[PDB]
Each structure stands twice: as C-alpha cells, then as structure tokens.
Design a protein around this ligand. Sequence first.
Ligand SMILES: [Mg+2]
Ligand SMILES: [Mg+2]
Ligand SMILES: [Mg+2]
Ligand SMILES: [Mg+2]
Ligand SMILES: [Mg+2]
Ligand SMILES: [Mg+2]
Ligand SMILES: [Mg+2]
Ligand SMILES: [Mg+2]
Ligand SMILES: [Mg+2]
Ligand SMILES: [Mg+2]
Ligand SMILES: [Mg+2]
Ligand SMILES: [Mg+2]
Ligand SMILES: [Mg+2]
Ligand SMILES: [Mg+2]
Ligand SMILES: [Mg+2]
Ligand SMILES: [Mg+2]
Ligand SMILES: [Zn+2]
Lengths: 99, 91, 69
Amino acid sequence: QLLKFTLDCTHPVEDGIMDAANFEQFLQERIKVNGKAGNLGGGVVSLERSKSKITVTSEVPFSKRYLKYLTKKYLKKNNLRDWLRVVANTKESYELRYF
Amino acid sequence: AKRTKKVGIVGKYGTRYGASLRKMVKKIEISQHAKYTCSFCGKTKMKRRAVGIWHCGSCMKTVAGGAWTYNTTSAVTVKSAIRRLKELKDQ
Amino acid sequence: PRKIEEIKDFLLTARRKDAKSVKIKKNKDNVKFKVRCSRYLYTLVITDKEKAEKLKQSLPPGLAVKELK
RNA sequence: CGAUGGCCUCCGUUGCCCUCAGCCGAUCGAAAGGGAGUCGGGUUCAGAUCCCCGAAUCCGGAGUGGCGGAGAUGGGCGCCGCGAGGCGUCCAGUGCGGUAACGCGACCGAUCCCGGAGAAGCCGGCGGGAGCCCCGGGGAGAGUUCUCUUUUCUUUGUGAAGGGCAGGGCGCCCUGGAAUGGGUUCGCCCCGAGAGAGGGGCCCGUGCCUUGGAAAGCGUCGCGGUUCCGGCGGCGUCCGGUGAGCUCUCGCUGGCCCUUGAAAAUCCGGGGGAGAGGGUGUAAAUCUCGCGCCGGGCCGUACCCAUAUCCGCAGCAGGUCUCCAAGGUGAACAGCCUCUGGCAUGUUGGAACAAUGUAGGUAAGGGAAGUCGGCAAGCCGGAUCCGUAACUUCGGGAUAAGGAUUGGCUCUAAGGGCUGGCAGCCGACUUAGAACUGGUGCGGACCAGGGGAAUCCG
Ligand SMILES: [Mg+2]
Ligand SMILES: [Mg+2]
Ligand SMILES: [Mg+2]
Ligand SMILES: [Mg+2]
Ligand SMILES: [Mg+2]
Ligand SMILES: [Mg+2]
Ligand SMILES: [Mg+2]
Ligand SMILES: [Mg+2]
Ligand SMILES: [Mg+2]
Ligand SMILES: [Mg+2]
Ligand SMILES: [Mg+2]
Ligand SMILES: [Mg+2]
Ligand SMILES: [Mg+2]
Ligand SMILES: [Mg+2]
Ligand SMILES: [Mg+2]
Ligand SMILES: [Mg+2]
Ligand SMILES: [Zn+2]
C-alpha cells in the first residue's frame, strides 16, 4: 500500500514572491504522524523536492486534505492568502493559482 | 405482595361513589371479567364480549347468557322445569 | 422496462414490426442495447465486448440505430 | 314466425309469439366518508404530478378479430419400411404437478344460489421498516490561523411499474406423540381438540440489487458562443457504526364499554350444471396468458390563506379548519440560545430625562401595627437520600408536616454484544463510591407546590 501526493507551487515561484524552501521545511517540521510532529515520526513518511514540485510519500493512511490544510496555513502565515488559492488539478495533486 | 387489604378490582375507583356502592359493584365486576370454562371444548376461554354475549376464544362458539355471569339462576331453573315439562307431557 | 437475459430473443423482439429504434450505450464494463417498443423498453446487457461489436451488425437493416455519445 | 343487408354462407338489425323474474321504491344529498389508473428530469416575468423530454399505467372498443401460446394432438389394431419414419381402421382428448398446505402462462359454461372485499371504536405495550438526528473516517469547496487546532462548516443520489433476494407475520400443512410437564412474552399466553423437535406452504415485502439509470441531477475545476446557448469538457457522487433517540408506517398482543363503534356504488370467488365442439383434423367451440391496434369528452386549476388579499365600516393587539418540524440544555413539542428560511420593531422621527402615570426592581430596623378583608407583592419550588400525624368510605390524606445534599476536576466499581467457566474484537448510555479543589458556591440563568389547625355549604 502506497500513498503519494504532489504540490505545485510553480506559478508563484516563477512570479517571484515566495520560494519552495520555506515550504519544504515547514512541512518537515509540522507534519505530525500519530499526532507527533517530531522528525516525521521516523522515516515512515518521506518528503522530496523537485523543481517547484513537492512530493509526499507514505504507507500509513494520510490525508490529501491534511496537505491542503498545511499549505493554507503556510499561505496565511506568509501572507499569500488574498493572492494565492490552493486547488486540485487531479487526484493526489494540489496546485496554487491566482484569482 | 398483597397490595390492598379489603378492596379488590374496584380499587381503580379511588375514593369515589361510596363504600357500599363500590363493594356492591365489586362482585359484579369480578364475575363479568372472570374467564369461564367452555362447556363445549372444555377450555377456560369463555369471555364476555358484550352484554349477554359469551364467546369462546378457541372453540369459536358464542352463547347468549346473563349480563354479568355466564348463566343465571332464573335461566337454569327455567331450563330444568321445561325439561321436566317436556318429559312429562309425552311420558 | 424489461430486461432480456439470453441473446436471441433480443433479436426476436428487435425484428418485430412494433420496434421503433435501438440505442447503444457504452459504459465501462457493460454494453447496453435498448430497443424501444410500443409498450416497454427492452434492455439487453452484455458484460464482455466482443459479443457486443459482433452483434452490432446483426440488427435488421431497416431498424434505426443510435450510438449514445 | 315474419323481413332486410353484407361473398344473403353465418351473423347483425329489427317487428310478433313462447319462455324467464322481487323490490325497497323516481330523484337529490360529501371538492375531509367509499371511489380503477402518473412518476422522474427540464422549462416561465407570472402555470405545472397539467407544457416539453423520458419512462409507465387504468378503463372502454374492434364484421373479418391482428398475431403467437393454451384447448393438442395420444393409444390400440392391420400394415409398409431393417429401422428411422410413413399409410388404412377403431378409441380418447373442455390442462398438468404436489401425501398436504398449495403450485404452474391460460386451462369452456347461462338463468339461479352462497360467500368475500368495499366495511369499521377508543386506549396500552412491544417488535420490524423507512425519514431525520448522532459518531469514526475518505474526497471536493470554503472559514480561522497573534498561539493552537490530522481543525470547523457545507455537500457526498435515484422515481413509478416489473423481476429477484433479504426481512416481518401466519388461528397453514406433513412426521411424531409429551409428567420429572414442557415452550415462551416486557406482560401474557400455548398444548392429546396434538406442545416441543425436524421438514415445508402461504401473505406482506414501502427495505436491498437489477431493468429505468447516467444518457439525466448535483458538487467542484477549465474552456468556449465576445452573446442569442437543456454549450462543451475533465474529476467525484466513497467506506463504515450505533441509539429506551423523534416522526411516519406495518404487524403482534391486551385492556374498556348497561358505549360494541356506517351504508351503497363497484368488483371478485365458489356451488351447480342448462348449453356449445370435433370426429382424428387445415382439428373446432372456448381462453381472466404474451404481444399488437384505436380512444378517453365537460368543469375547476393564477394569487392571499393572515399582526396588510377572509369577517369585524379600516393595512383593526379580536376571530377564522389543517400538513411538514433541525442543533444545545433539559423529563419534555416547557423556558432560553442558535442553523435552513424569513423579517425591519408593527400607521412617524429628532432632542431632552420635570411632575403625575403605566410596567418592572431594591430597600436599614420592625414584620400585617395597614386594610372591611394579608388585596397586591413576597416566601416555597427541580431532583436524590431520610421522615411523614389527626382522620378515613381503608382507596387516601401525601410532594402531609419536617430534615440533609446538589458545582468543577481526577478516578474506581457495577450494569453488554459478536467470533473462535476461556481468549480475542467491538460498544451504548447509566448508577454508586472516593480523592482533590474553589472567598460556603453550586436545581447559580431558565423552568419551578408557602404551610398548619378549624367552622359553613356542595
Ligand atoms: Mg348524487
Ligand atoms: Mg367525494
Ligand atoms: Mg410446533
Ligand atoms: Mg454525469
Ligand atoms: Mg396554485
Ligand atoms: Mg420599540
Ligand atoms: Mg420603524
Ligand atoms: Mg399592521
Ligand atoms: Mg401602535
Ligand atoms: Mg425592609
Ligand atoms: Mg432585613
Ligand atoms: Mg387601623
Ligand atoms: Mg394573592
Ligand atoms: Mg392536611
Ligand atoms: Mg357544627
Ligand atoms: Mg360542586
Ligand atoms: Zn369452546
């Protein structure tokens, strides 16, 4: 059993108001597994950085809506809420687009 | 346990209508609601449907009888006397 | 509506004078042949595919055929 | 019997005769009683079970009945033929299966007769099924993100009519014959007039699956007609669990009656057996079976249905019959707060805050001294645990009277299901006890009996 999800912040990084770095360590600190946010709860869940393509892999049950909630929290924290919006292209996917 | 010491079925009437009236209707209510033995099928299922109607639960036979009891003393004496008249008339 | 479960009586009802048109519905895992008669709509459901498109040319020539796209 | 038309066949149309036989009385009387049969999606400025689209259905009609299937096609004998199969004589054939409940696609039949459905009160308890509510997750979209929150909110489906299967009920049948009595309900109740135990049959199946049906609907993301579009595209419409929960409905069972709780239209079954069909076939009469053909006329249909469309002289605080009914607290359809939906304070606004009013409150000490009169106001008030007198028609009085407790938080104990004295896995609210703790405060708002002793009357 494999769970696989992707995040596409390509538009805002090519525009130049936010970068994928802060995004990635925001994930690897604040992802909690069985409620513990330390070190991704071990190697049970893996994070990978592509060219503005953030990939999350796991085998324990995971929530695409968890991922959406975390990216919304990032957008609010770094003040992009009124500019960006997180939607789903297809399954196992999210992408950030303007209004 | 014994719920009431001297009032029976008419305990449902509370403190109304008077003691003499209540104890007068007590026996009639007990007789009216009692279940009798069907003389036809032998079961104890002769229950009163209405005034003078006594229906058998399983036997499915209904009989005309008294208003509060299955039989009445007047009726049984009349039946016996009429039987005697019948046998005596033809010897 | 009436379901036809064996192959040949479907053609038997298809060739009746009453029949108006047959429409072919192609969803996943099923192929449905719906023939519209005066009283009922007769539906024949084929699970596989090869029976479906070797029957698709077995309908009478004079009967209208409509593929649901 | 007499005449006509249609290939004057067979039937129809009459006119006359024979024969057959009740009416509960013409007729009216219900837009809540009885009363066959239509549902889903879309559409308007205003109409939709009525329009369009798609699926149905009831009733009525049809010379030749339009058609299939049933009635139906077998047996005997003499034969032919190796047989298969085919000839010539007789005889039957208004269906068949199951021990039974009864079943099968139909399975002739008149006057007449019998029966059923229509067609039945109020209340109680319990169980089944839906709708709603609730809990744990997957999605999709939104809200908060000063800190926290795998977070909070919305949404997440299938008609009628067929077919099948669950699931309910049976006062239905067969075997067998039971005390050491047994089965069983919340209660009952049941049994040699046949219980338990097996095996069946029937009815309702509004639930599930399927045909309808994804093609439509809906939720999102994106392209179009720059518009006039049932526009076109992608994805999704998922998996579970529980409840003395509420409403509706079905069913079982009981209680109450000096109360026994509609009629007719209409429809159906049965008993009978008057009649009809053919002489072995091209079978016939006849079919409540399947499909096919035609039609369903007349009238109402907008809107309000009420602190503004009705009646009160009026946009009048009055009156006027009904259905639907979320979350929290709580016994509760009580009161209070909120969601869907709705509204703009009830035929005016602004500024002041005098008297007197109207409607709410609070008062030191006293506590009915006020007054005709405790009028009014005030006291009590829920629940749990104790306790409860005189008198009595023995049922009551009674929540008599009189006491104690009540918050928050952290625990403990007890009360169950499913699978394979035990083990594992799930679970719904309760009840009791304990510790700690707060400025003695805890039915903290709301809801919510003052009490006792006597006389008169009924
Ligand atoms: Mg009338
Ligand atoms: Mg009527
Ligand atoms: Mg038995
Ligand atoms: Mg679709
Ligand atoms: Mg209307
Ligand atoms: Mg005001
Ligand atoms: Mg105003
Ligand atoms: Mg007004
Ligand atoms: Mg006013
Ligand atoms: Mg004072
Ligand atoms: Mg004081
Ligand atoms: Mg004075
Ligand atoms: Mg007073
Ligand atoms: Mg007293
Ligand atoms: Mg006296
Ligand atoms: Mg009085
Ligand atoms: Zn009897």
